Chain length 390, copies 3
């Protein structure tokens, strides 16, 4: 009580405990995070959002498929070549680390990790269309791990559609063996035959509801010797505006502390790219269970040690702080993002406490307003400060 | 390797008209039926929970009495002709809606509907979006008949006397009836029908949120010897944009096959206007999971409803001349992806190198097969 | 003729029974109405809305805090100084009776009743962000009634954050602190907090408070007056898709039977008493007219589902306020009277078959009432 951690902290999603494997072989894997809403009523409004983590070895290819869900794809580490196959055309995009791209629901696509000696790590925000809680991947490919969805149609339908005998269709499309799974390893020669065509990093990508964007290609919103914060919002990008989601990429050096702060209205889903950190989230809980009886809220403390691939949810308005125990970088999706205001609770810049008039501070706290202000102005830095460990 | 097959009553996406419709009202002049809730039959249709489907049918020279509902309506005339009159607080507007024409009736709008034809029945399908309870709506009839009391009767005598500035005896005799019609659908004399056509606005030209529209009044998006597809999207109509819904009207001749395809993001609710057809919908099952392909099939007939979840491949074989209508939910920017033929075929956009590893045969042999069918959209079912 | 009244009327919320106390001391109280959706499926779409009532004595201050919910604040009685504290600025506004203002979710704010003698009464529509059904107030202050949320952080985090040893942090911020979240201030302190506040100006701002009565009433006669502001006239209202109504009625006046086409209405009695009659349908699908009646008094809340006919008889001079949810293009259809009467727009031939009497007779009855919207109804 008063201090929840582990399974007692519903906002912490340990990567080795809360991810479900959709597919996995020796060339990579796809895992989906368990539902947010099933763990806490305080995440009920994240019910139509799922998080997917993808990782593949060098020279790999995720076979063509589409899903009944909108995807906001982000490359955490490595390089990827995303190809959107449309009914009458196709577009390839080279997505370097930090780049993101929206993939409308039902868009057939495939992507490759063109790197010869580096893995590819991607995180995707998924918004299911048919059932708000779950989506399904439809693979067109026919492998030992799955049958092409085309096999879903009867012989008569297939023959008339392809204008050929089923024996042939079956031999060519369903089965000259076939691949093991949806993730296959290609040779350098196979890559260039279509990769060298893809579109590399664009200029000011944040201007097309179809072109990928790099939130790192912008002036950090916060930046000092302890950390830097890059962020792209609905106000800055079309794809983001449609999803009403903002994206953040935060770098923090060992021993840095991201000061206590809260987002006014955005619900934040963060993922550790690399590094380790200690996080503290502050919530409230009513100890009075008799509805028609006076409420009685007590401060609740939710903590966790975050590591690579871990996911943590910061409900809107909940104060939070992060102490980087090693060089760190985390990414975050801000849901209900439009006009979000990040309120810091210490330091110089963006400190909402410093905007409170002296007289109000005086009655709000034990000490005089003068003394409260003296304490407030003690910290010389803003946003990120020295965690002063040991 | 034979995929699992679910047919007829085992197919949650198929709604046989004689099994899944609940009668809201019926008499010798017509009937109103509401379809069973989508979300209750499958979690894969959970996002259709805010949508109800209503089928209305009435005999020649009939009138559906004035009423309003706590639901937005997208009314479509499948067969026959209708005169829809929207009564507002300060005015009224009558519109002639011929077969294929549609019109949105904002929630709470008092209205009445007439089948002005002397011989043809009127068949209508309506998409309903409830306001108070997301799952259901209620019709508030202002009329007083043997089948129902006016909602005005819900007020007390004193309130009514003060409101109408009349003794209750007069209010009662005039509006409640302490002779009244049998039900909410009545037969009018041919002479009365004409007495209500003088202000009926006939079909016009091309984009108002008030007046009705005709989706079949544009070049079909797909058209050939085997069939044609008419479609109006939210991008082409404000009423449709407000609802984020598109409407389709498809004609297919006997023996025609609507090629395997899927809608990228739209959830489709189709209804058979006339004719018969076989349909196959492809879904999937549930390391942790090995998504297996399932075939949801059914024999479709008049008035039947079938739901095609977004992104699920589907194909239709018309066994007799056929026409069906469809409502596309979550319509904005929907992309129809065909899986065969020489037009809109997403498979023909996949580079050979990818095909090479995506299927057993070589990329060369896959392309060969893909180009075999030179026809597009609709082909001979052979 | 089944009538569901008082305690059995799910749409009626007696203020003396359905409000839960969130905070209360000798200086004021904050109460939240129980959830609408748990009372009836007919109010299921009101599940993302909560109603809060606030009352405080003269010269009082509601301490700095924020909530994970959008608030649409309305001053029913008195005057308030609302100060919104942002990350890098603050804005203070004077809100007189009848004025309203939206407080975006998570905005830290404090509220003062600057009057030296009068109390302050406010009602707020709340739209929760994390749990659609409930929100929580995060008080930054440290009082006997609640500790600052800053105390939720570990000593090491607070020490590094403020660059001070915990001893001093604790004595300054946590620890003589006030008893509760509503405190009485000295007249001198109150004056300092109101002198720089922006007074009520003229005419449509994204942040500025607005007065729904600073416009011509949409309905007005000897017996009643109705002011209304729609999303089509104010950006804050447009963002919420909510309209706000404020109507005055003389004792004995009757607001004629009518219905809102698509808006779900949540009304709150400001002052006075009235008898309300709501008409529903208790459910082929043989529907039956259901009568929902109630005697309303100050602070009571009553919900009128969209499209449901309703009538209100004032039994004393009365004023009520109302929030209209799903407001865009709502059309209020009256069922009697000389204006906005939907019945008067139905053709004779249709009336002829819709009712027992002849069309001309029905029409005769319809035009009997010369008054519009409000009429005198005294027994
Ligand atoms: Ca003090
Ligand atoms: Ca006729
Ligand atoms: Ca092959
Ligand atoms: Ca009659």
């Amino acid at each position: 009580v008063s201090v929840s951690s582990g399974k007692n902290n519903p906002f912490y999603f340990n990567s080795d405990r809360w991810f479900r494997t959709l597919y996995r072989n020796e060339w990579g894997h796809i895992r989906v995070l368990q539902r947010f809403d099933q763990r806490s009523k305080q995440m009920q409004n994240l019910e139509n959002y799922r998080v997917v983590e993808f990782k593949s070895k060098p020279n790999t290819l995720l076979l063509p498929h589409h899903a009944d869900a909108d995807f906001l794809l982000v490359v955490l580490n490595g390089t990827a070549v995303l190809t959107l196959v449309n009914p009458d055309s196709r577009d390839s995009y080279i997505l370097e680390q930090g780049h993101a791209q929206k993939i409308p629901a039902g868009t057939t696509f495939f992507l490759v990790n063109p790197d010869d000696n580096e893995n590819l790590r991607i995180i995707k925000l998924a918004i299911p269309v048919n059932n708000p809680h779950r989506f399904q991947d439809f693979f067109l490919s026919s492998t030992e791990a799955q049958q092409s969805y085309l096999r879903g149609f009867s012989k008569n339908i297939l023959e008339a559609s392809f204008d050929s005998d089923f024996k042939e269709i079956n031999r060519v499309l369903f089965g000259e063996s076939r691949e093991e799974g949806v993730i296959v390893e290609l040779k350098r020669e196979q890559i260039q035959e279509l990769m060298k065509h893809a579109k590399s990093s664009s200029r000011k990508e944040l201007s097309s509801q179809d072109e990928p964007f790099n939130l790192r290609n912008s002036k950090p919103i916060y930046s000092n010797k302890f950390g830097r914060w890059y962020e792209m919002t609905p106000e800055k990008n079309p794809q983001l505006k449609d999803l009403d989601v903002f994206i953040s990429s935060v770098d923090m050096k060992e021993g840095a502390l991201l000061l206590p702060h809260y987002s006014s209205k955005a619900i934040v889903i963060m993922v550790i790219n690399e590094g380790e950190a200690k996080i503290e989230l502050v919530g409230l809980s009513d100890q009075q269970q008799q509805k028609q009886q006076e409420e009685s809220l007590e401060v609740q403390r939710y903590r966790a040690e975050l590591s690579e691939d871990d996911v943590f949810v910061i409900p809107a308005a909940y104060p939070v702080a992060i102490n980087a125990t090693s060089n760190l970088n985390f990414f975050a999706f801000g849901i209900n993002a439009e006009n979000n205001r990040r309120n810091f609770l210490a330091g110089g810049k963006d400190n909402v406490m410093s905007e409170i008039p002296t007289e109000v501070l005086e009655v709000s706290f034990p000490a005089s307003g003068k003394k409260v202000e003296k304490l407030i102005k003690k910290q010389s830095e803003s946003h990120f400060v020295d965690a002063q460990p040991e």
